[PDB]
Structure 1
Amino acid sequence: GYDYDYLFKIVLIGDSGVGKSNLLSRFTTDEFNIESKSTIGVEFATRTIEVENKKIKAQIWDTAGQERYRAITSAYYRGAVGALIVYDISKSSSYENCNHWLTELRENADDNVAVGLIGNKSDLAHLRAVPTDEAKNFAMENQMLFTETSALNSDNVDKAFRELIVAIFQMVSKHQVDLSGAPKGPTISLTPA
């Protein structure tokens, strides 16, 4: 089972009630210890994908601090080489907190970390409260990848996550070389007396 060459830590962070719990169900595997969201601060998910003929394991930490997890949520960004900021385009309050989350990441998370942006529940165009233009403009300033995801518009988050993994692997990978007519016969002693 332990065949994956690299283990990347990713944090799925966003405002409470945004819908992260439904979001990761698409690009994650739903088995093992489910729930445990409030037990410590996090719920865990795993994904395996091959990049440049090298297996990569990605572990997703969807932390969420309600009122108790002040220092613990901070400690949970100890070595996250990736992050997946999420907001809902229904209420501008979730979008307004994106800068605060990004500040927490870039202050506490791993140095020079690659971070993306996700707009959930885009199918609900009835109550759209944030435009894509402003989202892209805010993404440009902090060199973040950006997309919008929905249940009906599925399979885009999978491509975005794979693209984020590829971006990480092309930046935290040290180049290696593929290291894989010997003599045969009866030898004769030649050491001096």
Structure 2
Amino acid sequence: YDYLFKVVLIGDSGVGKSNLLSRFTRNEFNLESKSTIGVEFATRSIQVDGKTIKAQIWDTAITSAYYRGAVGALLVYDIAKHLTYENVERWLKELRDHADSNIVIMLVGNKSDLRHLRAVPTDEARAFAEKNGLSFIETSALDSTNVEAAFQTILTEIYRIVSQK
């Protein structure tokens, strides 16, 4: 009711953007995967410091360009496929250019449940994570881990913009 937060989910295809949203927004998961064609949102309202907010999350045919007025972005990579981690640099360059130059960003390593097939160490990511002005949680959409936390981090992160006189 009080605020409307525009948030984007971005990342390479296959990283789990669409299943995070389904976990977070409807608490549903599926191994079978219909590619997202272009764009989705789904929506859920939460309460921070006794205030009613509403998060509008947009999942993502390169030109989505849907960023504008996009205050927050969850940038996701698949921990079990190193290449998805490699393009995070290219995902932060295209970020600035077609998207708000002061957007709140959280980096997300998804598919944390694949412990034994892990191909991207938490430290290398978190190192790059704290080296630059990004957030750093690790999630598993499949076993509903850190999913609420991830959103509520960025939303709390987001909230602290009040900047009053």
TM-score bracket relative to the smaller structure:
0.7 to 0.9
* Alignment partner of 2:47 out of 35, 47, 50: 50
Matched, 1:124 2:114: yes
Counterpart of 2:40 in structure 1: which amino acid? E
Matches within 5 A, 1:130-145: 130-145=120-135
Q: What is the match of residue 109 of structure 1? A: 99
SS in 2 for 1:163: helix
**Relative to total residues, which structure has the larger helix share, 1 or 2?**
2
CA distance in structure 2 between the aligned counterparts of 1:29 and 1:123, rounded to whole angstroms: 20
Across the two proteins, how many residue pairs are aligned to each other?
A: 159
CA distance in structure 2 between the aligned counterparts of 1:155 and 1:129, rounded to whole angstroms: 19
Q: For each residue in 1:29-67, what CA deviation from the matched residue of structure 2 results, as whole angstroms up to 9, or x when unmatched? A: 37xxxx8932xx10111111112222111111111xxxx
Q: What is the match of residue 37 of structure 1? A: 36
Q: CA RMSD in A?
A: 2.2
CA distance in structure 1 between the aligned counterparts of 2:132 and 2:97, rounded to whole angstroms: 14
* Alignment partner of 1:59 out of 45, 56, 59: 56
CA distance in structure 2 between the aligned counterparts of 1:52 and 1:122, rounded to whole angstroms: 30
Measure how far apart 1:144 and its partner are.
1.1
The answer for unaligned runs of 5 or more in structure 1 is 64-68, 177-193
Measure how far apart 1:27 and its partner are.
1.2
Matched, 1:148 2:138: yes
Q: Is the 8 A contact 2:18 2:36 kept in 1?
A: no
Measure how far apart 1:175 and its partner are.
4.1
CA distance in structure 2 between the aligned counterparts of 1:15 and 1:124, rounded to whole angstroms: 18
Measure how far apart 1:78 and its partner are.
1.1
Q: Give the TM-score taking structure 2 as reference length.
A: 0.87
Superposed structure 1 runs of 4+ greater than 6 Å apart: none
Pick the structure with greater CA Rg. Answer: 1
Measure how far apart 1:141 and its partner are.
2.0
SS in 1 for 2:80: coil
Matched, 1:164 2:154: yes
